[PDB]
């Protein structure tokens, strides 16, 4: 069933101000961040994932990995304190989402960033999934002890160059940011299993839908559930490839003759926010928004 | 409405449907389980799988080996592993020639296979009965997508055997035979069969997989909600709580255990026996047994 009467941003703009959507749901990953000086994962050169090398991982994931971890652990403890000092401000795309907010239209923001640039934008708690974690609360990784020790006594540690360790039972403590093999926040579950229920538009924006289960999230929404891509490139449609991360048919689908619903705006994610506030008449709104709220943060 | 098609989550539940009238039309999902007992190793078996087994070739990690971005910058280990796995032959085990049993009782609609052993042709199943999914090594093509140009199983085995790196005679870009790798699309046949197979399915028979690549783990996802899944493996497969990285995508995984498990029957052991079980349960037992007998004698008549 088609809702969109052209597959452009133009006509996703035209479905917003119609009376069949009421309910938005973001999607977003660290292309959202990055024009706040926060590198993302995956880009060739500049993503975290090229920048490991004096770690001497197996691979670079192995620093967010929850074995690993166990049986080296220093190197995640090192890279984070290298990047947790980092002062950073919510971009453009984080002000439009809390623009969503304020007009009513945002269901639920679904992120896969720890950098919290979401609730420095405005986004409060019930507004967001946390899907990959926060690094506010930190907890011991043993299974029958699972002590919670807060920020102060992670930051005390790390800067103190001490491995964390739990006071009652010795095992590693780590921040509450979700590793590779392990479990994600039951906030996730909960908020997924009846959010997209009733979605009437996804946007997704700044990821390549490479990592599950946050992929599987677009294969949610009802199938006439418009979705719209705001990205440097296009993510999360392909032919079937061996070790491709979305399930089989549950990609998106922009340009077989088949497409129906799914869009792809290519290019920076602030500036698709831009043309998708214009076009809904709230250029000059979301822009003094910016504005106000950077002054703010530098005082 | 749940339609609730097995009377008990056993393999006895499962041979009385598959009895009934209701079940007309089944879809074989294998892997590389399905020819260790013929003497093929696996992949992810610990210690005895094909990735616990790579050490000399001093890979980045164990896939490397079947990726195609690794094989473009560095093809030698994938050929001197290929040396030591193309010679060799192998009989179809019990678990082939149940499905051949399938075949001819006009019970099997596709077998979807991860193998490129060829065991299942070798049992009997014919072409329009196979989806090799992963792949064949009887045709080989060179990597360079506008060139593409295609070579025999022959040229191919000149190649190797003569301790050569294959490459293109109108391009220089290597050369490897049609098995898929990491990073490869998938024959087209996969996708077409897949649309048309899965929405008319009355039973998925799961043998001899981890259930651990995409897109084929997807597959049991695809069919009707109400189609009983029978999972024939040493150990439980696809049945995991979700983590960072999982492989199924979110409630795409068999569920044998939960209390809202209706459908999904896992028989843990070797395939053979438990394909033997099943025959014994469904009266097919001794036809199963002299098939293999005489399939096996004919293939040590040459
Ligand atoms: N300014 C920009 N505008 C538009 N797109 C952008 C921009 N900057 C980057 N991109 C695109 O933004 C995308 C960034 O993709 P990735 O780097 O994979 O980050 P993720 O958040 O999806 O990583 C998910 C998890 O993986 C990790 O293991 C952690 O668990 C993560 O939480 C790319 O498509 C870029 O082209
Ligand atoms: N005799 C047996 N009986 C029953 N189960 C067995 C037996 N032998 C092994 N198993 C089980 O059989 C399963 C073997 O699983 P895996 O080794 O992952 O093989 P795949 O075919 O799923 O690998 C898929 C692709 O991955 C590769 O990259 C290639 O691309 C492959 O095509 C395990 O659960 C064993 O416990
Ligand atoms: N610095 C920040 O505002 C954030 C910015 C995103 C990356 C990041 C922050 N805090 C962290 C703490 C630990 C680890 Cl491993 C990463 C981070
Ligand atoms: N902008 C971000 O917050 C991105 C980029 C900074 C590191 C980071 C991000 N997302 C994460 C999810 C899990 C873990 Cl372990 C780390 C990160
Ligand atoms: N030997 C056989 O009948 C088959 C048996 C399965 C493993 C295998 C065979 N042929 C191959 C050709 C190349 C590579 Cl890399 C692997 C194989
Ligand atoms: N029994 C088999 O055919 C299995 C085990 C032998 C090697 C092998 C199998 N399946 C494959 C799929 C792709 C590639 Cl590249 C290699 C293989
Ligand atoms: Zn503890
Ligand atoms: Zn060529």
Not at 113 to 138: C, K, P, W
Not at 141 to 164: D, G, N, Q
Not at 201 to 229: E, H
Request: hydrophobic share 40%; with cysteine; aromatic share 10%.
């Amino acid at each position: 069933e088609r809702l969109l009467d052209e597959l452009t941003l133009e006509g996703v703009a035209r479905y917003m101000q119609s009376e069949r959507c009421r309910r938005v749901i973001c999607l977003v990953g660290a292309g959202i961040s990055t024009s706040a000086g926060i590198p993302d994962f995956r880009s060739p050169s500049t993503g975290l994932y090229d920048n490991l090398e004096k770690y001497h991982l197996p691979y670079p994931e192995a620093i967010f990995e929850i074995s690993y971890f166990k049986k080296h652990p220093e190197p995640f403890f090192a890279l984070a304190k290298e990047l947790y000092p980092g002062q950073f401000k919510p971009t453009i795309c984080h002000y439009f989402m809390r623009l969503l907010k304020d007009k009513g239209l945002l269901l639920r923001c679904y992120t896969q960033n720890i950098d919290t640039l979401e609730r420095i934008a405005g986004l409060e708690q019930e507004d967001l999934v946390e899907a990959h974690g926060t690094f506010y609360t930190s907890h011991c990784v043993s299974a029958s002890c699972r002590h919670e020790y807060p920020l102060s006594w992670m930051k005390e540690k790390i800067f103190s160059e001490v491995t964390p360790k739990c006071e009652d039972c010795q095992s590693l403590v780590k921040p509450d940011i979700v590793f590779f093999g392990e479990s994600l926040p039951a906030r996730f579950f909960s908020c997924m299993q009846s959010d997209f229920l009733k979605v009437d538009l996804l946007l997704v924006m700044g990821t390549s839908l490479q990592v599950q289960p946050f992929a599987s999230l677009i294969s949610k929404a009802p199938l006439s559930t418009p979705r719209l891509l705001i990205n440097k490139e296009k993510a999360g449609q392909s032919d079937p490839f061996l070790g491709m991360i979305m399930g089989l048919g549950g990609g998106m689908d922009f340009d077989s003759k088949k497409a129906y619903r799914d869009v792809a705006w290519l290019g920076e994610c602030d500036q698709g926010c831009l043309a998708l506030a214009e076009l809904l008449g709230w250029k000059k709104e979301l822009e003094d928004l910016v504005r106000r709220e950077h002054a703010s943060i530098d005082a």
